[PDB]
């Protein structure tokens, strides 16, 4: 206690500066800085030593005098207040969302300054991680992945774009497709991003973007993989959220000529938009450029939505310019808009119960126009559309549908059409930068981040499961495999105990008894029930740590068979299971599929082709496991994005919110491991072998281990900076620049170091 300031708990800041006045047996007595007398108690566990200079920060948290969760937090906070959003933990990068545009840190000049630079020789930056992946790709001859993680709104998508800009601008061609990988983005975001209450630009699908390289290590092309577009959003949103951006970009920015041809109007006029928020993102100027006939009553009364990045009218323009830069012609552009508008009109079709015997329903007379616009835009016969929406084929006979069923059919058609449109968009983007062969790639992974709301459904379940898989890859690669390597090599590093989540994964995906398999079972039963599925889950996993029955409120609560709590690595989430069975089924009824494949329009037909049950859950599992196989085969780098607060505002560091993210991400565990661990390593026989042919007949040439030691000394290392295992030599944090020199294989460099080594062994 003698006699310095310490860190101790604080409910909103995470930690606070205090002094140890009295020392009890199980607890200490703390006086908060500048409050003498208004003390409080804290368990000895909960109190940590502080850095002596509180206004100074370090670039790598491994450089702190005391490595702990409170000093890590403070160091991040101080850098944040100076608008420095990036900090290292050894070779892992931490990125806190600034929520404003920090001048010049992403400029061309900044890009240039990071090229070829070793980690630790420039300030922490996403560009440095990207450059590191490129350098390792060449030197190790090994494909690379950059994994960007974080909860919704933390900055994964922005940082993914920074990485892609850096690599194509630095190692591209300066010709055409260098820009194309970058310029594709606004196109994918227009179709796949939407306003949620957590992020005005939320990604509603995951992606892995690969940049492929030739053997001379120049960019030859790209490939974008995409995962599970959120479907429900297409037809209904909550009052503060929107549908995908493209719908508002079109309504706001389309020319009068296009608006008329697509028969568009203000967003309040469409069921598929009008339960959600119908306001545009716009500012004082861009609002002048949006015509009055585009503005809903909500918009005229409350004004525009504000975001420092999004602008519906401006983004429509940028999106069209992007389409042209990547080689989409005006014809293809209008084809896309036609399908979008065609989906809008489809949602405006309503039904009414029919008078006849064994009757279903008819289109309401006031729906006649929507039916007309819809059929024209999709190349369909009105009568065919009418029959496909109001009847069902089933043995040969046609069955009338009730109004609800017709509602469901209308929406199923809309979801499949929009979803196939999205697939078409991704594939068209891939055709923008194709390639025939490549040597290696650098891939950047950007998933939909961890999220939860008042009510969570199948959509959140799939998203959070994807996040759980990603954290497990992080756990496996960084915390598990690392410590096992230290042990197999004989290093004697103190085991670091960490929170593993394989059990959460097993709960979801295990054969027969995993949640996904039990759900599939229910789809295949004679009379499928959300309640039966939910009971079976609880039954099969009574007392599992990661599953729980909802708790019941006395202030509406959720019954045993109406939901469950999953304890995800990022916190517990309560899912309502209604509609889990229906949402788990991806098959489209024959009558609807056939309607579409017979469109007059080639473009429409080609979206589909050049009890049927299909599992959404299991298809997604299969895709993620293929992704996982690919990541395992690469060198992986990690960027942990952090959301500073819940209001999307700059300069509001919420200490406790941020601490919790540092804790569940495993970054606190990594910092602990780096106290005694080694982020770099190389086989010493391999080092020796690479130098051998430049070595004269001297002591150095006879003994590989002694040669490596002399090499290390000649590049400035001492005994404390490295350690020999059984087959590899390991290097401490802070020595990345020296490690790169050790690994370098340029013949002139080797010959030079040989000359120095022989002086060290004379
Ligand atoms: N480095 C950054 N610079 C400026 N703005 C940022 C940065 N990172 C995030 N943002 C802002 O945060 C919002 C949410 O970030 P995004 O990357 O969309 O989150 P997610 O992690 O869900 O992908 C962005 O639309 C942008 O306004
Ligand atoms: O708000 V995010 O792009 O993690 O879905
Ligand atoms: Mg995103």
Automatic annotation (TrEMBL):
Q: Choose one Gene Ontology CC annotation of this protein and give it.
A: myosin complex
Q: Which residues form the Myosin N-terminal SH3-like domain?
A: 1-52
Q: Where does Mg(2+) 1 bind?
A: 157
Binding residues for ATP: 150-157
Q: Which GO terms describe its biological process?
A: endocytosis; protein transport; sensory perception of sound
Sites where the protein binds Mg(2+) 3: 157, 203, 446
Mode of membrane association? Peripheral membrane protein
Q: Please indicate if the UniProt record lists NADP as a keyword.
A: no
The answer to whether UniProt assigns keyword Transport to this entry is yes
Positions bound to ADP = 97, 101, 106, 153-158, 199
Q: Looking at the record, which segments are called Actin-binding?
A: 624-646
Q: Which residues form the Myosin motor domain?
A: 56-744
| Superkingdom field | Eukaryota
Keyword terms of this UniProt record: Actin-binding, ATP-binding, Calmodulin-binding, Cell membrane, Cell projection, Coated pit, Cytoplasm, Cytoplasmic vesicle, Endocytosis, Golgi apparatus, Hearing, Membrane, Metal-binding, Motor protein, Myosin, Nucleotide-binding, Nucleus, Phosphoprotein, Protein transport, Transport
Where is this protein localized, as stated in its record? Cell projection, Filopodium; Cell projection, Microvillus; Cell projection, Ruffle membrane; Cytoplasm, Cytosol
Could you say which residues bind Mg(2+) 2 here?
157, 203
Under the GO molecular function aspect, what terms does this record hold?
Answer: actin filament binding; ATP binding; calmodulin binding; cytoskeletal motor activity; metal ion binding
Write out the similarity annotation. Answer: Belongs to the TRAFAC class myosin-kinesin ATPase superfamily. Myosin family.
Q: What is this protein called?
A: Unconventional myosin-VI
What is the phylogenetic placement of the source species in the record? Eukaryota, Metazoa, Chordata, Craniata, Vertebrata
**Positions spanned in the full protein:** 2 to 789 of 1266
């Amino acid at each position: 206690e003698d006699g310095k300031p310490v860190w101790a708990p604080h409910p909103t800041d995470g930690f606070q500066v205090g002094n140890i006045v009295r020392r009890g047996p199980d607890s200490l007595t703390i006086e908060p800085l500048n409050q003498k007398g208004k003390t409080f108690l804290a368990l000895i566990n909960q109190v940590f030593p502080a850095e002596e200079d509180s206004k100074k920060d370090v670039e790598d948290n491994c450089s702190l005098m005391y490595l702990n969760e409170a000093t890590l937090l403070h160091n991040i906070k101080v850098r944040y207040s100076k608008d420095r959003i990036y900090t290292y933990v050894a070779n892992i990068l931490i990125a806190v969302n600034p929520y404003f545009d920090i001048p010049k840190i992403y400029s061309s000049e900044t890009i240039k300054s990071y090229q070829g630079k070793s980690l630790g020789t420039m300030p922490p930056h996403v560009f440095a991680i990207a450059d590191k992946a490129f350098r390792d790709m060449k030197v190790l001859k090994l494909s690379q992945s950059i994994i960007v993680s974080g909860e919704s709104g933390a900055g994964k998508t922005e940082n993914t774009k920074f990485v892609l800009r850096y690599l194509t601008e630095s190692y591209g061609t300066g010709q055409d497709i260098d820009d194309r990988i970058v310029e594709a983005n606004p196109l994918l975001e227009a179709f796949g991003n939407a306003k949620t209450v957590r992020n005005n630009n939320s990604s509603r699908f995951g992606k892995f973007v690969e940049i492929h390289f030739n053997e001379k290590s120049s960019v030859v092309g790209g490939f974008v993989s995409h995962y599970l577009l959120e479907k429900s959003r297409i037809c209904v949103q909550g009052k503060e959220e929107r549908n995908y951006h493209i719908f508002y970009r079109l309504c706001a920015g389309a020319s009068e000529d296009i608006r008329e041809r697509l028969h568009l109007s203000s967003p309040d006029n469409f069921r598929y938009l009008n339960r959600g928020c119908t306001r545009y993102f716009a500012n004082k100027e861009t609002d002048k450029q949006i015509l009055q006939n585009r503005k809903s009553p909500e918009y005229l009364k409350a004004g525009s939505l504000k975001d420092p990045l999004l602008d519906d009218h401006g983004d429509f323009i940028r999106m069209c310019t992007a389409m042209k830069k990547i080689g989409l012609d005006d014809e293809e552009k209008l084809d896309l808009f036609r399908v979008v508008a065609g989906v809008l009109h489809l949602g405006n079709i309503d039904f009414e119960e029919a008078g006849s015997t064994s009757g279903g329903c008819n289109l309401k007379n006031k729906s006649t126009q929507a039916l007309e616009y819809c059929a024209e835009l999709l190349g369909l016969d009105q009568d065919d559309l009418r029959v496909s929406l109001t009847t069902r084929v089933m043995l040969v006979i046609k069955v009338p549908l009730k109004v609800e069923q017709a509602n469901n059919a209308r929406d199923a058609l809309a979801k499949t059409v929009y979803s196939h449109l999205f697939d078409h968009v991704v594939n068209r983007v891939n055709q923008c930068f194709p390639f025939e062969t490549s040597s290696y790639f650098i891939g950047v992974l950007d998933i939909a981040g961890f999220e939860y709301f008042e009510h969570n459904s199948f959509e959140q379940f799939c998203i959070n499961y994807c996040n759980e898989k990603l954290q497990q890859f992080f756990n496996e690669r960084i915390l598990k495999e690392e410590q096992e390597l230290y042990q197999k090599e004989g290093l004697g590093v103190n085991e670091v105990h960490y929170v593993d989540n394989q059990d959460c994964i097993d709960l979801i995906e295990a054969r027969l008894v995993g949640i996904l398999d039990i759900l599939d079972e229910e789809n295949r039963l004679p009379q499928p029930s959300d309640q039966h599925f939910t009971s079976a889950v609880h039954q099969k996993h009574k007392d599992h740590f990661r599953l729980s029955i909802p708790r019941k409120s006395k202030l509406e609560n959720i019954r045993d068979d109406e939901g469950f709590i999953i304890r995800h690595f990022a916190g517990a989430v309560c899912y309502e299971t209604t509609q889990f069975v229906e949402k788990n089924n991806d098959a489209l009824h024959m009558s609807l599929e056939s309607l579409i494949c017979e469109s007059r329009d080639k473009f429409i037909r080609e979206l589909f082709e050049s009890l049927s049950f299909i599992s959404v859950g299991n298809k997604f599992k299969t895709q993620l496991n293929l992704l996982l196989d690919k990541l395992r085969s690469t060198g992986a780098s990690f960027i942990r994005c952090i959301k500073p607060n819940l209001k999307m505002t700059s300069h509001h560091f919420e200490g406790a919110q941020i601490l919790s993210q540092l804790q569940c991400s495993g970054m606190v565990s990594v910092l602990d491991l780096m106290q005694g661990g080694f982020p770099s390593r190389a086989s010493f026989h391999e080092l020796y072998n690479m130098y051998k042919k430049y070595m004269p007949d001297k002591l150095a040439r006879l003994d590989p281990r002694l040669f490596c030691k002399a090499l290390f000394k000649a590049l400035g290392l001492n005994e404390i900076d490295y350690k020999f295992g059984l087959t590899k030599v390991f290097f401490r944090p802070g020595k990345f620049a020296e490690f790169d020199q050790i690994m370098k294989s340029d013949p002139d460099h080797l010959a030079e170091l040989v000359k120095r080594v022989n002086h060290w062994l004379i």
